[PDB]
Amino acid sequence: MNTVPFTSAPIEVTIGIDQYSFNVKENQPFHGIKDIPIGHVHVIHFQHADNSSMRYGYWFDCRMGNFYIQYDPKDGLYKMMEERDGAKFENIVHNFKERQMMVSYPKIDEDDTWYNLTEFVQMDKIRKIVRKDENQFSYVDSSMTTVQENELSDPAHSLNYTVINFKSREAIRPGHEMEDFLDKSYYLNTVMLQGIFKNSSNYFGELQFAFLNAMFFGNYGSSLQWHAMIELICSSATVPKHMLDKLDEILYYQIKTLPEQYSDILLNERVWNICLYSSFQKNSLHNTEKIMENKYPELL
Amino acid sequence: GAMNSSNYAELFNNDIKLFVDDTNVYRVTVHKTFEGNVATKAINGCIFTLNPKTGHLFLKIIHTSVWAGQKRLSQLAKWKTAEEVSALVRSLPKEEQPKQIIVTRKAMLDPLEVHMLDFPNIAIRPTELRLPFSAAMSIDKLSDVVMKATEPQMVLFNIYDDWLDRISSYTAFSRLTLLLRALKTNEESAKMILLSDPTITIKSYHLWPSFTDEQWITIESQMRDLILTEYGRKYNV
Numbered sequence A: 001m002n003t004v005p006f007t008s009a010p011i012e013v014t015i016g017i018d019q020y021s022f023n024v025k026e027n028q029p030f031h032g033i034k035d036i037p038i039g040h041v042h043v044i045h046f047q048h049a050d051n052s053s054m055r056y057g058y059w060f061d062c063r064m065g066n067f068y069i070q071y072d073p074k075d076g077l078y079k080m081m082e083e084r085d086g087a088k089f090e091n092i093v094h095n096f097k098e099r100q101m102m103v104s105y106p107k108i109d110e111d112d113t114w115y116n117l118t119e120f121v122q123m124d125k126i127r128k129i130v131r132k133d134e135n136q137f138s139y140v141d142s143s144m145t146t147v148q149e150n151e152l153s154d155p156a157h158s159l160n161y162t163v164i165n166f167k168s169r170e171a172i173r174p175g176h177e178m179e180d181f182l183d184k185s186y187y188l189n190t191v192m193l194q195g196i197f198k199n200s201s202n203y204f205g206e207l208q209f210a211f212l213n214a215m216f217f218g219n220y221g222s223s224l225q226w227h228a229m230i231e232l233i234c235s236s237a238t239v240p241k242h243m244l245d246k247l248d249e250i251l252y253y254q255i256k257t258l259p260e261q262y263s264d265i266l267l268n269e270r271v272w273n274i275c276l277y278s279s280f281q282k283n284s285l286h287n288t289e290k291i292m293e294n295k296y297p298e299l300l
Numbered sequence B: 001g002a003m004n005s006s007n008y009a010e011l012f013n014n015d016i017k018l019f020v021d022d023t024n025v026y027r028v029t030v031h032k033t034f035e036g037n038v039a040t041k042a043i044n045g046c047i048f049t050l051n052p053k054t055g056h057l058f059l060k061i062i063h064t065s066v067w068a069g070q071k072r073l074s075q076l077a078k079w080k081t082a083e084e085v086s087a088l089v090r091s092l093p094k095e096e097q098p099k100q101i102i103v104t105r106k107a108m109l110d111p112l113e114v115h116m117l118d119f120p121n122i123a124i125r126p127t128e129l130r131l132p133f134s135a136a137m138s139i140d141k142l143s144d145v146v147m148k149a150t151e152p153q154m155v156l157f158n159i160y161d162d163w164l165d166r167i168s169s170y171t172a173f174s175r176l177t178l179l180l181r182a183l184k185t186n187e188e189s190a191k192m193i194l195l196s197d198p199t200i201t202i203k204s205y206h207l208w209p210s211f212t213d214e215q216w217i218t219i220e221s222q223m224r225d226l227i228l229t230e231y232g233r234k235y236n237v
């Protein structure tokens, strides 16, 4: 189990760690988060008490370094940093644990939610979507736009998700116009899976990462990407059986975890009704359809 | 964006454009089988592609052979239409290719857009107008060449005959759409109107009778009368 210490908490902020969150008061003696499970990526995120605009946060993996949080009063946000002196870090953390100034990552033992939400997500792929190579961790916020969004303006602060576009030459083979637009199997299996992602695990990783950025930061371009990647699978007549089974599980846990009060903005009526009821895979997503129907029957 | 009453003069400016109407591409008769079930038999069709400024009609005849062994024919029809339009554009010299293609039914938008991906600078647009181009098969010479075709065939007509020698394209399009609206609302009466006087003929190279300016005004008035009536006859007013 690893630890992310905080130098201090000078401004009142709601802090998130994965799907958990807690309120910290202005200058409350708060010095970090302990007992963070090894083996998964994590995200630590922030919403200031004063400006609910700009949720923001950091993707990281404690196996890749010793990371901490320090408020910057000039830029006015909590910043993740890496500590390169391992002895200094161990010493800081042990003192803060002895004084019990740290919250405990509060995982229930029965609970596999975070694993299920992040199964295929890997830090190395996050870092290629979020390009900032001098840090081992990745910053995301509500406002960041995607590469595809920019093509329809600062390239350094973009989310470089894989561009998916159903009405493009990449997706449509000359002379297969109708075939390829109504059955996207070519685009899914040959173009994207074999050509671009290489395997379905990297595809699912980007899909899961896009969902989490949409949920945690209300990042609209990420929500668009999550829905596009779902629709590409569901609108393909030919999908490996193992991919459909896993997709059903992935989506199930995403729908289970989504705040009931955000379904209006984070869920696209058209995509979901099409995927569950009209598409080739309308009968291949049993778990997802059952939770969608019992939790958000209004959407459908 | 969409074409409507408000940007109607754009049709007659100097940017090349085409209307595409697919309503007569897939055409069927519905009949009973010996077993008392219902079946369709397809008949020849056509794509109606029209330059509203010049009157140039590119009538692509759709032979029934193109449906043989195919499923979901009403969906294919839209894609077949888009394939044929895209082939037409590619066959034209660059300086004759349209800058916009206006489809008369919104369901053609995605088919045409996908088939025209090679032409990013050609705008594909819908319209809010309820244009009467389906009544093109009420024009006897157009109907006759469609029904006689024994293979796929493109036939090139000027739907305005020689009208542009005396009137503007705006006025010619208004005349055309009035004639077609009439033929669509009451084919028999409309056709009675156009031929009642045996002394007015259709030149071999024309689609419509050789009316004088004054005779066209009478004709147009009669077509309006017909259209207003049928509208009463229909709603009782």
Ligand SMILES: CN(C)C1(CN)Cc2ccccc2C1
Residues within 6 Å of the ligand: B056, B057, B058, B156, B157, B158
């Ligand atoms: C018979 N007329 C001379 C046309 C065909 N020769 C001129 C033209 C050009 C393009 C499309 C239709 C038409 C009609």
